[PDB]
Design a protein around this ligand. Structure first.
Ligand code: L9C
Length: 166
């Protein structure tokens, strides 16, 4: 639709988790979140999953949460079913939140992703297009986008930004 344009927080959105159940993202109010588009057959799948698991293990007790959205739009590198992707993520000992596969670009992009991309200046992205697998957004406790990190930036580079938002 168009109402996503008017939102001011991630917490105004909902999304289906990887089991198919709708999740209201306002449950993340009060938590610092990394939101990322993931893929199982990407050249950087291992480094992204393992470092995201490591960050979550290290900072969940501080309030860090991670929202992973599978997306097949980049080299068709997430071709499997939601059940297969859940089983894949389990292989990296993922304990953060897996969502159902979505689009992140184009007219059928999930509204949360349409919204994140238009956030200002250094928060949202340039060109209204996610470029590849494993773009990361840092979301503060109020659900606002505070930083983004591109497909080639390892998740551990986010660690230096976390203390300003916990
Ligand atoms: C979990 C947590 O939030 N930590 C922390 C506090 C404040 C900030 O920045 C505002 C950040 Cl990034 C993290 C832990 C932490 O507090 N570790 C110390 C453990 C402890 C031991 C005894 C009593 C109380 C706390 C941090 C993780 C890395 C650096 S600080």
């Amino acid at each position: 639709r168009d109402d996503w344009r008017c939102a001011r927080s991630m917490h105004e959105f909902s999304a289906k988790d990887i089991d198919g159940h709708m999740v209201n993202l306002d449950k993340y109010r009060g938590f610092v979140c990394i939101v990322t588009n993931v893929a199982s057959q990407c050249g950087k799948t291992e480094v992204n999953y393992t470092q995201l698991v490591d960050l979550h293990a290290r900072y969940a007790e501080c309030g860090l949460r991670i929202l992973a959205f599978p997306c097949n739009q980049f080299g068709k590198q997430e071709p499997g079913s939601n059940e297969e992707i859940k089983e894949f993520a389990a292989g990296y000992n993922v304990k953060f939140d897996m969502f159902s596969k979505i689009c992140v670009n184009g007219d059928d992009a999930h509204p949360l992703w349409k919204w994140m991309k238009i956030q200002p200046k250094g928060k949202g992205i340039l060109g209204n297009a996610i470029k590849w697998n494993f773009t990361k957004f840092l979301i503060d406790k109020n659900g606002c986008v505070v930083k983004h990190y591109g497909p080639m930036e390892e998740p551990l580079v986010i660690e230096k930004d976390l203390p300003h938002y916990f």
